[PDB]
Amino acid sequence: YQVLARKWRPQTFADVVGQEHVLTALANGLSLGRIHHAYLFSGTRGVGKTSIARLLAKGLNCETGITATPCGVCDNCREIEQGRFVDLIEIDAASRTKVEDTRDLLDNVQYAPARGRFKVYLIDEVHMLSRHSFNALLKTLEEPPEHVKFLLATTDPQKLPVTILSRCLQFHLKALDVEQIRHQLEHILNEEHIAHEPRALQLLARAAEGSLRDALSLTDQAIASGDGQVSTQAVSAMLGTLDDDQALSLVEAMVEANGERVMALINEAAARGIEWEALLVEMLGLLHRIAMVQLSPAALGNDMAAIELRMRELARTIPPTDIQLYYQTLLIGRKELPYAPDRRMGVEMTLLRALAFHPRMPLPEPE
């Protein structure tokens, strides 16, 4: 019943998917004993900044000692897992943004930790602190007490002062790869004994750009929609993204200058009950993929492999100039869609623009 994101939070360094460089650096630092007093974590949403920070806190305060492989069973590990560890001070920058609040926070830094071996501080979205707060924090960051560790975190590291950046070891977490997201989703679903299909996992991974938290949220929503199962049809309906084959056929009809097929395809889409702007976006994405394939050969991911060969044909037959013309026509039509009398009418008129100005086979021009 518990949310996937909360339930499947990492509890050991092995559980973390991706971010190999930061994990290796932290493990080596803990093992060799060359531990710095201020670590800054950066990246995008849901990449695992807080997860890695909490894993490091567990490693530092573990009963067995400072190690890169915390046991996960001693009292400190359990308390940190439950978020009820007294020494692990989870602070929010926005909660205390004024200089007075951060000074009050730093007033108690000197006191020894209650039971843990370090008084770890974990500040979330540290970039929200004011300039005065940063300057006040500089002195403690440079020379903190030997039993005090700072674990800053922020999605935007460019806002921090240069002094703060130089006073701490930076670790910029990278957006997780689509394959890594898909593998993690498959692993968690298999562990939870839930039926799933490869296409559904691919669609979910594509939907989650690089944030695994978004992937987990979308997976939970798909579980709800599909009544305990992750089916390709359910995920496609929830995402509102029709199958790539229909958009590919639409663009093939558009380039061939045969409007009858275009009309039939849009009628079928209307019967299916799919928002028209999504169809236009899919057509634009297909055109962009064709243009990229023309630019470079390896421009299509394995997810589109099922339709790669066909796509390549469109790259060879269709010149680049008319590809750009079609892309621009579709983009301007999407620009005009909100002000059109109807979404169907807007898409139909955009397709008629594309056909009328078709370079190879222009629509007949009666006087």
């Binding site: 007033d107 108690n108 000197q110 006191y111 020894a112």
Partner: protein, 366 residues
């Protein structure tokens, strides 16, 4: 470490040490009082870096020697909030302090005593006992003249000079100098040190008219006062107090002896009838006559005539009513003698009977 006391004995010393210590501290540990139990005595120091108030209490329970620092505010709240007459047993476990009172238990976080700012081992340059009455008289005589807010930081306080068997205090604010001397009775090396305004205020606050001999220790830059089982240490304000010897007129031939009460009531009447600021009152003194007039060019001249016992040369001087009123208030007696040289000179005020204290003021030029 371990000891046991009664909140009745700790309510007063905790209040005393925690009194001056207020507001946020410059250093976190300065916000904590250092309590140490040793040789049957518990000493609590509420250090403020600039000032240190130490209160000592007697221990009769089977204590254990040891020192530690703890925040003053919450410890005082814990001691005060317990039932009246309840005994407090304090112990140290790990880095925390456990407080037991009957059925109640508390735990407090304690910083190490090493990080506490240590009181340096400076040896007092001049140590001597003194009764409270003499010190209180000196403070009262030489506290109204010190400048409350002056650019010259050394004039904010007042200068104590010990010479031979004599202790002298001189205070000034740029216009008047009040100097009061008292024979200590024991020969001591010559030494001068400036005590700041806050230090003297705290010292006079400590005075309570008791029989405990007040022991004063003057160091290179610190002044310490022992009253019974209480210690007050302050940092002497640096600089160089101007020498008072040159200020004192040599031969103020002209003399004026008059009833202190008469002058007091005359000045009070002038002030109440001349509440307007600025425009220092002009007094014309003549043979058996003293006419005080308001300098206010706009307000009606509230001239007041008194029959003083003066029979010398007549002249008009533009004094400040508030200054003379305060100076006469500092000298509470029945008769007062003022000695001056000429129109432009420093008139010295003294008691017609006693001459230990001198009040060399100067007129306000008109």
């Amino acid at each position: 470490m371990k000891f046991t006391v009664e909140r009745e004995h700790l309510l007063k010393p905790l209040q005393q040490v925690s009194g001056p210590l207020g507001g946020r501290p410059t250093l976190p540990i300065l916000g904590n009082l250092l309590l140490q139990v040793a040789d049957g005595t518990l000493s609590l120091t509420g250090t403020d870096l600039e000032m240190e108030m130490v209160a000592r209490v007697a221990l009769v329970q089977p204590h254990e020697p040891g020192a530690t620092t703890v925040p003053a505010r919450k410890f005082f709240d814990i001691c005060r909030g317990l039932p009246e007459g309840a005994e407090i047993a304090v112990q140290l476990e790990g880095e925390r302090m456990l407080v037991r009172s009957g059925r109640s238990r508390f735990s407090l976080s304690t910083l190490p005593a090493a990080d506490f700012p240590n009181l340096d081992d400076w040896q007092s340059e001049v140590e001597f006992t003194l009764p409270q009455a003499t010190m209180k008289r000196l403070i009262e005589a030489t506290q109204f003249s010190m400048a409350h807010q002056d650019v010259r930081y050394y004039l904010n306080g007042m200068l104590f000079e010990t010479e031979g068997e004599e202790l002298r205090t001189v205070a000034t604010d740029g216009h008047r100098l009040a100097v009061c001397s008292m024979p200590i009775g024991q020969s001591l090396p010559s030494h001068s040190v400036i005590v700041p305004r806050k230090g003297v205020i705290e010292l006079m606050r400590m005075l309570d008219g008791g029989d405990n001999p007040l022991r004063v220790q003057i160091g290179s830059n610190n002044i310490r006062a022992h009253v019974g089982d209480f210690i007050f240490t302050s940092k002497l304000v640096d600089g160089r107090f101007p020498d008072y010897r040159r200020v004192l007129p040599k031969n103020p031939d002209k003399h004026l002896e008059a009833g202190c009460d008469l002058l007091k009531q005359a000045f009070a009447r002038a002030a109440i009838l001349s509440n307007e600021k600025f425009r220092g009152v002009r007094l014309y003194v003549s043979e058996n006559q003293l006419k005080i007039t308001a300098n206010n060019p706009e307000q009606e001249e509230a001239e007041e005539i008194l029959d003083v016992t003066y029979s010398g040369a007549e002249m008009e001087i533009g004094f400040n009513v508030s200054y003379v009123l305060d100076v006469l208030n500092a000298l509470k007696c029945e008769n007062v003698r003022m000695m001056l040289t000429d129109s432009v000179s420093s008139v010295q005020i003294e008691d017609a009977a006693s001459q230990s204290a001198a009040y060399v003021v100067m007129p306000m030029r008109l």
